[PDB]
């Protein structure tokens, strides 16, 4: 509301300069406005002589003025346009190094569209703040009052008369605000479930097109609608045209008229002394009204700032915390862990008390009722997120005492995205080593079944690996599992989940699975029982807890979960 | 080719409107002039002659009060029309728009078009047609009154108006080309910066990030333009209106002091002049404010315009009675490739599937295997062949009857919000108990209308009850089975995680007690195992034709394919 939640706090130095150009708009408004005080003065100079010079006085100083409050603005947005880059520039610099420090699994929570939206449309919605919504916030603002006071320092008697309008105003607009209490949320509420279904409709055209009877629905959701709209609008009808009809130039006109007439008749004043209200005084009104137009236009910039310092105050990674002396009893592998206990969004825990090992090369599965947290213990090994209590050790050193590079030369890790960057192929099967003398690349290509794919290619090897690049899901796994095999990080997270897409183009993806797990410690994420029934142990869970493990007959023969989870009517 | 044609022709309210609107300007052009006068009295030897023209100035306004008023309300009333006009219209539109018109970005843009253009059009008379209309004639009616009293004055109005006009619409132009080559600039440096969010997680991996993060970084620092080309052409943008003004109020004001000086007119009444001419200036700047609402509005209508003047496709006069029996469909070297470039192309497939089996087109990744079921429903267009299922042509067909003879199951299932026996029933607003019950128990779906807690009444729509993957598909291929239309053509969800969802496609399949044309894309062996005819497909044209058995004598690319099928479904991962 007040001086400073995290708004200001942003805006940390845009207050000396913005202060400048605040005064700066109101003294060029100022200088606007002024042209009428200089007609009122030669009205009166014209009624008591003329003459030759006076009168040219009188318009060069008019001249002069046009010439100096152009300038002064001229002046105004040039230095408002200056001072906008170098903030846009620092804002831009550490929001970028900002976003070089955030943990991976912030980018899977945002998404695709969140990122795009936060950067351009907050840097976009800002830079016009800054530029258009203050100077002429500002200068709404000052202008009335200006105005208000040249008109009370002339006469006392017409500016009172003239306050009654907008007294009128006023208490219609606050006897309107008492009709529409719950019916503005609601209206809200209805315009974001149209926006949904509208989404929901066309997303599934195509039904549409063959069954033509499923579009009954959004076509009673959209009469329903337009009734809302209309019989919420009917009633306001002349509470809004009175509204209006007291503010118009026309009613302030006739005001001044009878005001004036009834002072001058009688000899209560001059007559020259009413020249200021013929003049800017009759659009008083709808000045008015600006005000608030002037003071809304500032929303958008604000929710903007407070959105973009909310994301930019997000927690980093842990510290790189007290290097310890490793090798109680471990080896390079041997991933041990310990009562994890991650939970995320703390009230509800997704993780529990575990204590596992993976031996030094063999394979380990994490079957389990999907959904129930099975894949989030894995990611958690990668430093998606820190633990909350207990540590994990790759070997005898926990995670958290290992740097990003000793971190990724130990754990590599395949998941159910792509991830590819923008350049030659050459370069995306030799990311881990970016020198690789162009045949190394060409074996661990043709250790992926991948070379038949990228010889055939437009311009084979150097095709720039566009969104248009004509590839799809299996063709390009194989394109960064060719990649993760010059790695050679001696542990594996296999998302299992990734042999079974594009069914078609999977027998080659098995075969560089097959070829790129030799003798090195993995940690498979099941789907299916049959496909991983003769790793070397099974671990099932459900949210946490796991609840037996040990090898494949082991869990088969005890009553197990396993053997009420290998019952499916095998299948 | 309409813009923004709302309205029917109605004609009625429209010219009234149009003329209580006229009527309702001269009402204050009369009222200024009339003004003219007054001040003739005041700044006079008789201060007390006033009165009257008092009285025809109140006259004047109350008149234009009452005109006001009943515009005011005429204007709410076009409105609510237009607003219902023009959305059922564009709900009306939208199914006939060209399939391939919909895509990433304009599918969002047709999403804004109808879902946030309530408020913003209701009001729209009310607040941008009588207020900016009504402000530019009156300039021109003031200065006609005015010529008869003072022609020196009146003819110097009538040709600076159009001055103020042409003002107005530079400024305004100068604007918006300012703003659109900002924000382009903003989008053409923020890209790197969305590029480099996406990779974040194969970069670190690949233990990249820092010399990555430092290109980026000195490029984006290095890179300025200065800018200031864009602060030139930016401030004419600001500052011409106000100068244009500030120049026509020194010029009016001379030339009425000037004519005071020579003694043609009088001092008593050369204040009235001026005061008028002050009247004058006021629409000018009233019409300056209206900008932003304009621009907001243009946004708005070019959303909505955009999405009314999308293509169209194209049927007539289509001859159906059932198909006869069940039809035959043939193919001529069809060729649809979205533009000749990027695109599945199909550059010269040609069969007969005959009239009713089973026939699975099987064939390597490149989803042509998904537009030629496009092709043989309806949805797309053959840019150069002719599907004439049966005898006829589909394409020479009539849309009421060419959506009559396909049902079709997706890939990707997608049901509406509702009662998921309100989307069973989606197929055939008939459909007796006995058609529904048959559908409900040959997709194996009885089991979940029986485990469901109120029953066959829960409401899908989004985030289901669990209604992951094979629910909604054997929703799916219930209602698809429903539908009476004699061509089955399945496409086969990817799902390989239920066995009740590969029964329930077998059994929908090869069980139906009915009689059809039946297609399916197929990978799922157990699916192609019944089909006694399969079509191989690779880079469009098809590459084989057979019965299963013959194809795995001739040894071609159809023996791999199955010999890499009965191999990819019992892939072990132990290691040694």
Known sequence: ?571 | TWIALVPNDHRARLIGFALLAFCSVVARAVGTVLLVPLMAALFGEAPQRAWLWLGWLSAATVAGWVLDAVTARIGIELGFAVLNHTQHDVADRLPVVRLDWFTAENTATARQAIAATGPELVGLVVNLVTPLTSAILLPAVIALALLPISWQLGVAALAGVPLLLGALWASAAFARRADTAADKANTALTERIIEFARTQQALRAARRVEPARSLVGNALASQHTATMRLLGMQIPGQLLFSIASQLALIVLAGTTAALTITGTLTVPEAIALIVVMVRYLEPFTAVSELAPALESTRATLGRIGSVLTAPVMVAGSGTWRDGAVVPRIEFDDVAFGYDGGSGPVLDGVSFCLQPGTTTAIVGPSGCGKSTILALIAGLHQPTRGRVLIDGTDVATLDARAQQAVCSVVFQHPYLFHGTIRDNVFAADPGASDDQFAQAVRLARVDELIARLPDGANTIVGEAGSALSGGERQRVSIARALLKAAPVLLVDEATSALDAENEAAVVDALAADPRSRTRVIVAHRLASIRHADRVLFVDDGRVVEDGSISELLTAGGRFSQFWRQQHEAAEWQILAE
């Not at chain 1, 989030?376 to 790759?394: K, N, Q, Y």
């Not at chain 1, 038949?452 to 248009?468: F, K, Q, S």
Request: hydrophobic letters at 50%; glycine letters at 8%.
């Open chain 1, 1 to 571: 509301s007040w001086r400073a939640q995290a708004a200001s706090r942003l805006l940390a130095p845009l207050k000396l300069p913005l202060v400048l150009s605040g005064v700066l708009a109101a003294l060029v408004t100022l200088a606007q406005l002024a042209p009428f005080v200089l007609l009122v003065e030669l009205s009166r100079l014209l009624v008591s002589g003329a003459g030759a010079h006076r009168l040219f006085t009188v318009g060069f100083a008019a001249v002069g003025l046009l010439g100096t409050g152009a300038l002064l603005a001229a002046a105004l947005t040039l230095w408002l346009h200056v001072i906008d880059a170098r903030f846009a520039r620092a804002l831009r610099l550490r929001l970028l190094s900002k976003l070089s420090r955030l943990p991976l699994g912030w980018f899977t929570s945002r998404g695709s569209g969140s990122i795009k939206k936060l950067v351009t449309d907050d840097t976009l919605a800002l830079h016009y703040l800054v530029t258009h919504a203050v100077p002429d916030a500002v200068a709404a603002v000052v202008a009335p009052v200006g105005v208000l006071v040249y008109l009370f320092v002339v006469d006392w008697r017409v500016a009172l008369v003239l306050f009654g309008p907008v007294l009128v105003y006023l208490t219609i607009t606050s006897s309107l605000t008492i009709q529409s209490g719950p019916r503005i949320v609601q209206a809200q509420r209805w315009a974001e479930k149209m926006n949904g279904e509208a989404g929901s409709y066309l997303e599934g055209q195509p039904v549409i097109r063959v069954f033509g009877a499923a579009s009954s629905s959004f076509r009673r959701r959209l009469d329903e609608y337009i009734g809302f709209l209309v019989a919420w609008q009917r009633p306001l009808a002349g509470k809004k045209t009175l509204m209006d009809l007291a503010t118009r130039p026309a009613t302030f006109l006739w005001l001044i008229a009878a005001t004036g007439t009834l002072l001058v008749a009688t000899h209560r004043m001059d007559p020259v002394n009413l020249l200021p209200f013929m003049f800017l005084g009759t659009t008083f009104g709808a000045r008015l009204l600006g005000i608030a137009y002037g003071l809304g236009g500032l929303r958008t910039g604000l929710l903007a700032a407070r959105h973009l310092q909310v994301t930019l105050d997000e927690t980093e990674l842990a510290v790189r915390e007290h290097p310890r002396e490793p090798l109680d009893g471990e080896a390079p592998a041997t991933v041990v862990f310990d009562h994890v206990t991650f939970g995320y969004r703390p009230g509800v825990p997704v993780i529990q008390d575990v204590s596992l090992t993976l031996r030094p090369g063999t394979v380990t599965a994490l079957v389990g009722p999907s959904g129930s947290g099975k894949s989030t213990l894995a990611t958690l090994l990668a430093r998606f997120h820190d633990v909350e209590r207990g540590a994990i050790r790759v070997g005898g050193q926990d995670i958290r005492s290992l740097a990003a590079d000793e971190l990724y030369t130990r754990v590599g890790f395949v998941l159910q995205e792509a991830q590819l960057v923008h350049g030659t192929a050459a370069e995306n099967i030799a990311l881990a080593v970016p020198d690789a003398p162009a045949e190394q690349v060409q074996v661990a290509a043709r250790e992926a079944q991948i070379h038949d794919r990228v010889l055939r290619l437009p311009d084979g090897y150097d095709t720039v690996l566009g969104a248009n690049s004509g590839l799809s899901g299996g063709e390009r796994q194989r394109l960064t599992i060719a990649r993760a095999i010059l790695g050679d990080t001696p542990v594996l997270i296999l998302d299992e989940a990734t042999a079974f897409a594009d069914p078609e183009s999977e027998y080659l993806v098995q075969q560089a699975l097959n070829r790129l797990t030799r003798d090195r410690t993995v940690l498979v994420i099941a789907h299916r029982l049959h496909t991983i029934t003769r790793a070397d142990q099974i671990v099932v869970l459900d949210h946490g807890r796991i609840v037996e493990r040990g090898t494949h007959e082991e869990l088969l023969a005890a009553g197990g979960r396993y053997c009420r989870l290998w019952d499916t009517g095998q299948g």
